[PDB]
Design a protein around this ligand. Sequence first.
Ligand SMILES: CCCCCCCC/C=C/CCCCCCCC(=O)O[C@@H](COC(=O)CCCCCCCCCCCCCCC)COP(=O)([O-])OCC[N+](C)(C)C
Ligand SMILES: CCCCCCCC(=O)OC[C@H](COP(=O)(O)O[C@@H]1[C@H](O)[C@@H](OP(=O)(O)O)[C@H](OP(=O)(O)O)[C@@H](OP(=O)(O)O)[C@H]1O)OC(=O)CCCCCCC
Ligand SMILES: *[C@@H]1O[C@H](CO)[C@@H](O[C@@H]2O[C@H](CO)[C@@H](O[C@@H]3O[C@H](CO)[C@@H](O)[C@H](O)[C@@H]3O)[C@H](O)[C@H]2NC(C)=O)[C@H](O)[C@H]1NC(C)=O
Ligand SMILES: *[C@@H]1O[C@H](CO)[C@@H](O)[C@H](O)[C@H]1NC(C)=O
Ligand SMILES: *[C@@H]1O[C@H](CO)[C@@H](O)[C@H](O)[C@H]1NC(C)=O
Ligand code: BEF
Ligand SMILES: [Mg+2]
Lengths: 1084, 327
Amino acid sequence: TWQVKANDRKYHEQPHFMNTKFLCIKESKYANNAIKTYKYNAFTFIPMNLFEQFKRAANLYFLALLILQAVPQISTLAWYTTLVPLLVVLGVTAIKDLVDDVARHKMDKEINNRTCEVIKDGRFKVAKWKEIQVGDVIRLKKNDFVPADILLLSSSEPNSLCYVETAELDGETNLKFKMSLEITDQYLQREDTLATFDGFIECEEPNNRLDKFTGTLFWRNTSFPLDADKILLRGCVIRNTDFCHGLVIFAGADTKIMKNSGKTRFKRTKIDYLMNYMVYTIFVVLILLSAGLAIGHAYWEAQVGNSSWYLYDGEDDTPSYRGFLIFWGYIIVLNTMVPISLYVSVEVIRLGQSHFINWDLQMYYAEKDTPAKARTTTLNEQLGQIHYIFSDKTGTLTQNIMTFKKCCINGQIYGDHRDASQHNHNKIEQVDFSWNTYADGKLAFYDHYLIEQIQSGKEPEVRQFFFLLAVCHTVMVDRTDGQLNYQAASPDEGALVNAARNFGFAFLARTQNTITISELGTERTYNVLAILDFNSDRKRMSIIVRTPEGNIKLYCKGADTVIYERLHRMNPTKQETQDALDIFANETLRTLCLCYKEIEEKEFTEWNKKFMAASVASTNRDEALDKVYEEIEKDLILLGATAIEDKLQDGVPETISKLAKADIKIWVLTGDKKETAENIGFACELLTEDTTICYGEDINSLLHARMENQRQESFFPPGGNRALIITGSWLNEILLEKRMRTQSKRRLEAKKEQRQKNFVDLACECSAVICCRVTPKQKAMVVDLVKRYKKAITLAIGDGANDVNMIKTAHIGVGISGQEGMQAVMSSDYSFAQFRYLQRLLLVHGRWSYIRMCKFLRYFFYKNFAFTLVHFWYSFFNGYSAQTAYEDWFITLYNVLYTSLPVLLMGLLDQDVSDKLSLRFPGLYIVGQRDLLFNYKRFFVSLLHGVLTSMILFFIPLGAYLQTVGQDGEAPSDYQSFAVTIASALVITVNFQIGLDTSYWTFVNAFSIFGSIALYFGIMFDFHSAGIHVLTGTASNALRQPYIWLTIILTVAVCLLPVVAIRFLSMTIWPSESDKIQKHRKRL
Amino acid sequence: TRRPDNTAFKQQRLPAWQPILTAGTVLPIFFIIGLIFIPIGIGIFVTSNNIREIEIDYTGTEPSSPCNKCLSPDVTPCFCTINFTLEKSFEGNVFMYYGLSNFYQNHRRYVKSRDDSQLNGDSSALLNPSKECEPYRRNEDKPIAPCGAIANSMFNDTLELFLIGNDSYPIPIALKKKGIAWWTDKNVKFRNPPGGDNLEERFKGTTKPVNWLKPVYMLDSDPDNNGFINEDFIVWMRTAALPTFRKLYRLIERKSDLHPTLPAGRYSLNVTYNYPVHYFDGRKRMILSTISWMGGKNPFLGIAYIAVGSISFLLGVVLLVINHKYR
Ligand SMILES: CCCCCCCC/C=C/CCCCCCCC(=O)O[C@@H](COC(=O)CCCCCCCCCCCCCCC)COP(=O)([O-])OCC[N+](C)(C)C
Ligand SMILES: CCCCCCCC(=O)OC[C@H](COP(=O)(O)O[C@@H]1[C@H](O)[C@@H](OP(=O)(O)O)[C@H](OP(=O)(O)O)[C@@H](OP(=O)(O)O)[C@H]1O)OC(=O)CCCCCCC
Ligand SMILES: *[C@@H]1O[C@H](CO)[C@@H](O[C@@H]2O[C@H](CO)[C@@H](O[C@@H]3O[C@H](CO)[C@@H](O)[C@H](O)[C@@H]3O)[C@H](O)[C@H]2NC(C)=O)[C@H](O)[C@H]1NC(C)=O
Ligand SMILES: *[C@@H]1O[C@H](CO)[C@@H](O)[C@H](O)[C@H]1NC(C)=O
Ligand SMILES: *[C@@H]1O[C@H](CO)[C@@H](O)[C@H](O)[C@H]1NC(C)=O
Ligand code: BEF
Ligand SMILES: [Mg+2]
């Protein structure tokens, strides 16, 4: 088991704690607190990067050419200039993958240098997080992050109490109280005694079970057990505690939150997998064409080649060997169907497309000064194909801000825009709080009818209603400088105390038996007689106090349902209050019903003795306390209810609707409790009055029925609207995740596979799914199920460490930046501060990136087959001898100089519709959902397009060269002139095709298209040589004849005109969604 | 970090033109093309037909032809006489070609077999021919001057034309062998070895190609027409693009008077059969064509332009009705 010692860093360095690795590495059992999110550390860059470079099919295909060009008997190039092209192409991606990784090398530094405080000598000294080692004794202050999993040793608060927020670790927004051991509390207070502390801790091995912890502490010749209530995990933040002391148990990768992060995997796009299938197909086509032409050369050499005296090379090569030896000659000649620019262009396109995300001013959050960030430049067109979005709730859909909005008293709802004693107009100025001494401007309240009622006093129940908010709470108050700053464990009570403070019922100080609430400036000190604890099952808490006069009154506040079962028979406001709650409930506000009852002196005494008996009990005091709690609460006079808003991020409900119109399913995976998760679902509009909510119990009946049915039909009628609110505990049950030994396992996996599939079928039939109380492992488990059983492209958006697992498991992972915590941002693919920017990431950046990548692939393979297949058709007119139809110096420059730039700019600047118009029509995104622009079928249409283009590019010139073509002294009827005519027609044809593909004709797009053609016709007129001189003659002959230009014009026309007709015929008979918008663009 | 720069390129709002493939813009280009290609095709087809051409095949593969005797030349110098007549006289410059069929001058193993450095007059390459001309580097002990298969397999027939007049005496026809190659090839690509004045002393330490009867010293009497700058040699080395090709052989210049250059009548082709091509089913032809201001004689382009011009116009009508139906 794990072993830790205090102020002893040599104990953990013992020889027997070194696990040792297979290959000469120690790898100590205790991990240092330094973390790692990068990929390439110092020298693992080369082997690891080339390993993932060669996951691309073409890279292995290019490497084959290098091996094939090194064989002397078939080698066509020196082999010292075929390797350099490949290394540069590999180097371009290596540098691009290094700048991305250098960015997340800096991200580690700002988190590894968080400068906590440690005992490394007689007294505390400042030390970075990376300097923390297991067994260190550290000190933290207010609002400090916890460097690692520590054990409470002391704190300034009484009983070594400590409050920490776990919003990083789960979705919860309230603080957890952590306490230290009694013995450690009273003996490790003063800083000097911490240094001499020598305690030995034997605890569980590192795990991912945030909920529970097991271990023991041995100290002062005594053993004390430990539990999760004494351990602060790494993601926590210290709150409401000036300082605290801890002992590091786990650190770094061993921390209980870092074990919840998933495995970092190499993420590849759906088109990246597609590219592999196209390269595999071209490799098979390349092998078949070369083998077919090789058989032709073997047969041609049989009767024609052997009889040709002029074709004598002094080699006794049989026709079979010549055919075999030319098969590799045609592999080299026809290799350009997949050129080396395939991935240099893809990475240039992706790098630029990723910087438009970074540069976007519409995805820039000015308030926190947080611009968007594409921190991986390799998953861009996948943003245009998202099928599911899995979203965190706390901090992603919400601002973690909780404000007082309204309040109901005696059936009258107070909080609406009103003035004087009756509603006059909706436009109401801000309420004046200057009348209250303690009030401040945080509360934005628009209701003056309530102000008069409290001050007038004609309704005494109104004053008692707000006095309840100042007593029934359980938060402490800080009066360090008279500011009366409130420190609330639960933000619900923090907002209520702050709100009730501005209404005149301000809470000033607290005592073990008295309180110092001020009522409208009147100093009244009550006496606390008994506080009823708050717990989940009870769903309500109460307080028993004695008034200064002497009367005893019980003040209770909690859930409406529980209170309504404990109301007096006489309650005229019971029906009216129920109506008011429905108004707040329909408005998505948290309602806490307020109730009270009269307790007589004799009644309290008989109950008081029983309450003390339960408190003094040592066996089941918690159960005993609940026993007395029920007895006192029988008839409660309902007073009213409050209203508190869990402030969403602005633009969240409008984002979910727009992404819904794009046919994207949005699931909320949250670690917060069910009631909070469901409430935010209604606020986001994911759940509506139409939706019928199905919980874990309802789902379990359906899934179990389906298995019994077999022992597929939809689980619900097609026309229904449904949503799932499944608790993480229920998620394990429904998914069964809670020799004959080997035999039974196969059946165990048999039904488990079936059970998982049934849930995903059920879950994906619902309009919305909300998973609550799910651990970080379960968040990635749900994303995995959709990836596996639906083959869907999934996006995961979240914040904090509990979303790292699903962010790393989803196809695309988004982290919410701008806040104090950055655990999710480091592990994410994209980063922006506001959820509402998910509209532009998908419907603008992702949508365009998919269009621009598909148009690039369509043209790139078109213009390479059109260029390369000319060698195939020329084979029948040269003996299948692998002669090239172009000049040897045009083949090199074609893919770099004549057809490179125009597709790159189109891959960076094309826009089917405006961003303003692509957000207005989210349905345009649906084209990338179904993968319609570029299928495997559309890949072959571009091959047929390039195969037929090469047919025209060769056979129109060939018809003209079989006959007289300017036969004069300067006759271009030879191979060189034949070569520059197909090249001239090819360059114009392909560069006119990209002009037809381009839909956003920027000046650079026009310049590149005409520049590419002008550059070709400038190079082949000795203009390039003239410039070099200032700083063989075939073109000046072929291109000066009218027939050669008539041949070029005719060849280009036959290539392009059928394409224009097909494009126009398809646009006018089967217009796409974009085409309809472009036609009516002005009208819109 | 800080705010992004509000640049048009960075914000993806560059000024741009959005072309739409609308019916009112694509229908014209399918009609104006039809109205332009049709007249161009007719002009090409009509003018090409106006060119008067006579193609005479003298390979002698078939019997009953007056050249079969040279297919098996027991005597190395063999001669053939082929009689032909012109229906109407040729006017203007007349170009005499020779055509070779089923002769793959574009074969990869053949096209590479040359030393461009040597043909450019490089003293280093004169005695050190490149390995590209491997089978014809050295004949016995010294390198071939025009190394390679392309120079070795040079067409080496002699073609002569005679006019047979009323007196029946065959009048010889003056034939100009100069100015039949590209100007660049004469003065740039092909150049004699540097130094000396007599070609004998320039080509020292080099032998003739194995297939040539005489060396490069006296390919022609004129000092400006022998060596690597010989017109016939240069014309041959410009390898053809297809197995069937024609190479300019001689020029027939316009007569000083107004009479036709080649008056219609009786003609006889006196050819010295030297080049054997029958083993690989090769054909040898002699062609005479009249000069034309607009290119040569290309009936394929005329038909293709009319065919594409008619289809383009027909596509306009088919697209017009489709657009009207879906309007
Ligand atoms: C007026 C406005 C318009 C201007 C438009 C023009 C913009 C021009 C800007 C061009 C800058 C590059 C921008 C990126 C272009 C796309 C990616 C790419 O092409 O990578 C290339 C990497 O090249 C190689 O791998 C080696 C190519 C052959 C060796 C000789 C090249 C240099 C010749 C020196 C003279 C040229 C110098 C050119 C550079 C200065 C692709 O190589 P490839 O051709 O596919 O390789 C053949 C394929 N094969 C290996 C499978 C057989
Ligand atoms: C006459 C040619 C008939 C060819 C076969 C039938 C047509 C064919 O399969 O396409 C051959 C390729 C097509 O190349 P394209 O680049 O034009 O590919 C298509 C085009 O983009 C259409 O629009 P889009 O949907 O892609 O946005 C598409 O319409 P849609 O998907 O709605 O059906 C059409 O399908 P369609 O056929 O209309 O159903 C595709 O052919 O090359 C050519 O454009 C012409 C090359 C030939 C050059 C001239 C040859 C003499
Ligand atoms: C015209 O060109 C043809 C080839 O196109 C010449 O025929 C070739 O002549 C050479 C000899 O000059 C032959 O090479 C060898 O010749 C020796 C005898 O000298 C012989 O013993 C060898 O077996 C070998 O043939 C070559 O084979 C031959 N080519 C063919 C296809 O037969 C011809 O000589 C040239 N004539 C003139 C006048 O230029
Ligand atoms: C060809 O013409 C010559 C001279 O005019 C003549 O001697 C010979 O008989 C003719 N041969 C044929 C087949 O006409
Ligand atoms: C044909 O040319 C040869 C070569 O000069 C010559 O000897 C002969 O007299 C000419 N006339 C013929 C073959 O009728
Ligand atoms: F932030 Be989530 F609710 F886990
Ligand atoms: Mg969160």
